[PDB]
Design a protein around this ligand. Sequence first.
Ligand SMILES: O=C(O)C(=O)N(c1ccccc1C(=O)O)c1cccc2ccccc12
Length: 282
Amino acid sequence: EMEKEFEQIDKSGSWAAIYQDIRHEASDFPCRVAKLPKNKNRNRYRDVSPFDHSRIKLHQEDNDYINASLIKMEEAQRSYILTQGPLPNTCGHFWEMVWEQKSRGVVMLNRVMEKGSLKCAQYWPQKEEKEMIFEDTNLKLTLISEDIKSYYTVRQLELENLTTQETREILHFHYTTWPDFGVPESPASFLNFLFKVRESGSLSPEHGPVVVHCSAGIGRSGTFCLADTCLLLMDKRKDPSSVDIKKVLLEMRKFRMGLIQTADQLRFSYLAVIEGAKFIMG
Ligand SMILES: O=C(O)C(=O)N(c1ccccc1C(=O)O)c1cccc2ccccc12
């Protein structure tokens, strides 16, 4: 039971300790391809790399590298591609991935600029009339419409394969109110955002995996994936109270390092799941 485990830890300030156990137990696999000199400019951060076993490969024979990991949750039957906020030189790669993997949605959990510096390139067009063209991966992207709201914005985009002239509609789910430091006071809006993403059908099997990212694609992105999955499991099992969030986090960490960067995010994850649970039924 987590609802209880929560308070047991809160009034004991053991969050930092728990988080560390998880850090210690977490798996570690090689990232040999990510470290090759030729991909130095394909990584935003030197110490956030995709393991080789689970990395997303680009269908180009030149350089199939991109800092992106496939997180496959067998039991919950859900997959997610967690990636880093793209770089000024990897946007064409990013959309190539979205195309090749047949993704339907892109979930963005950060802003282009935070704490005064760029945390992600401006990879999507901001004005209907100014479409972007990525010449290296031969892709065209057009802003079709956007719906700006209190805590988030949803955009409909048209991605076209210039080689084939085939078009596809991608939904951009951009959470715009994640705080500069710390985590939200209330998981409330984050849960609404999540459900909003589920509702679009972007997390569904008939589509390629959803593309999720913040700046490094492991902290906030981790809380998103960890919350979704845990909620899905509490919904699928005979015994809902059998869902161990730490267990799930560790399973996800087999596919990508550092998912959930601080003890705060972990606490927040608990909160989002606990809150989301008291609502998936009434
Ligand atoms: O982008 C992330 O994965 C992330 O969650 N980061 C954070 C790390 C600690 C506390 C808060 C956050 C946050 O995003 O709110 C990171 C932000 C910027 C650079 C990072 C570099 C490596 C790992 C995590 C990073």
